[PDB]
Amino acid sequence: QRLRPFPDHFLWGSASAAYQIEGAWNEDGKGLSVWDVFTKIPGKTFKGSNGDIAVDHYHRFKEDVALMAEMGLKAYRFSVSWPRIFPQGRGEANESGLRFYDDLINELLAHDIEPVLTLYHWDLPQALMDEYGGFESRRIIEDFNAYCVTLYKRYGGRVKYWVSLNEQNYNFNHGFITAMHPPGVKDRKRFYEANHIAFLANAKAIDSFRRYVPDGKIGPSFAYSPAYPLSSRPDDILAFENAEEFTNYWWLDMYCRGTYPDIPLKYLKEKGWAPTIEDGDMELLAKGKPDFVGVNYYQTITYEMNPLDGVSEGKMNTTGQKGSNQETGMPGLYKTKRNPHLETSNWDWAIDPIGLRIGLRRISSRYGLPLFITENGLGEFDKVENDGTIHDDYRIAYLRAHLEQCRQALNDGVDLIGYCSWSFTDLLSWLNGYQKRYGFVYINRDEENVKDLKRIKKDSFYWYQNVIQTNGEEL
Amino acid sequence: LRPFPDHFLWGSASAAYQIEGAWNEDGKGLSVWDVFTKIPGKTFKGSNGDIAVDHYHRFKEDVALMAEMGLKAYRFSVSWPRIFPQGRGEANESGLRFYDDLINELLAHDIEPVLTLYHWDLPQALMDEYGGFESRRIIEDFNAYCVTLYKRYGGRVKYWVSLNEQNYNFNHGFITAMHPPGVKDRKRFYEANHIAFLANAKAIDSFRRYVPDGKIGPSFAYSPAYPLSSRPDDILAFENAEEFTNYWWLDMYCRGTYPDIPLKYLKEKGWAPTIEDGDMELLAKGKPDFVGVNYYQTITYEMNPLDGVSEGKMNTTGQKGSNQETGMPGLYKTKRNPHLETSNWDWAIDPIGLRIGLRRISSRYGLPLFITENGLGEFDKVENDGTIHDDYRIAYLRAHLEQCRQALNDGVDLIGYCSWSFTDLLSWLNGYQKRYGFVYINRDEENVKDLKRIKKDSFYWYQNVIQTNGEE
Question: What positions constitute the catalytic site (chain B) (predicted)?
């Protein structure tokens, strides 16, 4: 009946990011990233966890790729560490760093795994922060572009799928609104101005990609939480409308149309928070149209009316204590509300597989572009059993349900080209430590003890192995 | 909040068959509604538009009341069978002179005319000949009728509406059988809509040649969709409802393309329209200057099983609580919004929904917006002092105009606001007892009485709104 098969060459994938897996933070000439620094600030990370060693993927990448081949992955998404390539962020390139990702790519291609290369996954070189304030300076447009072009030249003959900026919205919100990411700022004006420069750097890098990799495909990976209204009360609908415009269309309109949504822009102008548009900005932004929209999906968010004296800031759950997450909002615009109809994880992330289908349809309907799920997964506590296995049936249940809704979205007509789970191995959660695990492959370490870093295939590894073998026929 | 724009079009609206009368005079051909209203059971208590309110003969009196109100704009409809009695033959000059004298009357009082090309009164001859909008021949005949109007009045009329409520009219025409041609067939519904889209685009393409300084757009019967709850199944129902009830028409009007999700579904069902060669190229030529918005209510939707609700009875009697739920099995069903009040005809009162709907169209399509209809239809009585205290109507219009100011402050490009309606008139299916007018008309379903014109309390309230440019 409705169990229609997935497309024959659907990109069954999994994903990682450099800072979360690589370790070797100060080896072979690598320069400091802003996270090499930020994780050393007391209280910024869970129980002092950092990526100095992470899961040692830089030295152990062949073991991990062999696990990907055992899995049968059709695609593997990874990011390149900018300060591993340019230790000072610009100027002289680090051949050891270029050689590492060159070897990684050849190892992947040997197993018929498509590389999906993320250009920017939050690890700005500290030298560029020191020099001119990172994304708060328009100088970053030229420096980010020069970095991207270096990779386009060396890897573009072999790598077809590229991601430009990863979760600009989420990363910059924590960087400039909540101060939970570098640079640790709480200022709405700076937030929108830094986002504006990041949009410019995205569009410049994509324009360059059209010339250096004309047969390639590129897009941003957006941190996507479709908005729900709490009720059919018109005030709650209007809160949902505002949330959709401010939290989703602000980035998605700019990425896909090259323009800002008018309703948020006019509101920001009155509050003094709008980005400054300089001469030539709109002409550059018009050149950044992507081949696909990368979707990082974990949960929907439900919204309700928020008075002018209402909620703004709230404390995030970074401990795994269920129900401790606090609501947030923009006074006069909207506030979050726990969805009463949804189960949540121990980190209070809502489990909403139908929301994935809803979100895929919304982007498909509004912008008419192909979609690529570049992240989807469940972060949970894992235990190793007496027989050495990890019975992560909760993770299988989550991934199964979301893959079922991917099938239905494909039935609905969305052009979904692939699906990358987060994450392939266990890795460092930026703010939640190593105990919030997402991997198919368990890594034996804790927050401050690396132990032996042993790789152990979880039960979800074998489930997804079978999903790929059957092209999604079985779950 | 920002004041209303300097040249904001404060207007009121009507439609030809609902006000004109004179159904068999000066050589006027038979409309599809002239025949349909004679069928027993199709109209409330047998009401018809043979006389209506006799605006044909009493147009100078009606226009005199618009000048007293200080209307900046007046939206009226031209009867196609009055211009072309057979639809496609020679034109009737008496009909062209009538609307000539009507427009001239409006400009003599500094009222901007807004001309609606088609307002559901298809000439019966075209139904007899090739079946109206079920034949691609209507594309040429409708264009020929539009072009004739472009030449005569194009110098005096700058604001035009192409097709009025294609979705609402065609749904009752081919799904519920409550409008002509009394059909209940999904395939015919989408085929007829598809030809209407082609006629719309052809007429707009011709408009750019003959009226290069004018502005034109369709008037869409717009009910923004709500989900009943934050249950994902109910959000999905709302998503389906928006695509099928709204994007199907709005994507076509503004983008020239059907939304992919409804199209794939309709293809699998065998209900999709056949897209012939030349269709997409023509449809790309019909981009409007503005989207005309007919707003009365929002609709709230919930999950609907495959064996679930389909057809439902409509409230045409004014007995509150008699409207039944409808839907599309497996996609969505309507559910009365527990947070909204309703009229005696079960139409939901949702002024904030107008702001929400204006923002949605503005966000998705980026086009100027023109509210071409908005009003409350309710029972009216005449007091002993000869007045009509329709404070319920004032309350409705006040709330919606407050939300129009908020939408303008938000950034929506709202160019005007036409109330429905200026004088009392025949509701197609609800008779004369469902009154929307600023001006009361003394008549009922079976008795013409004297068709006296009596100004309601809402008449003076709107008079003050225009004088103060919406400040009060």
Answer: 373 (nucleophile)
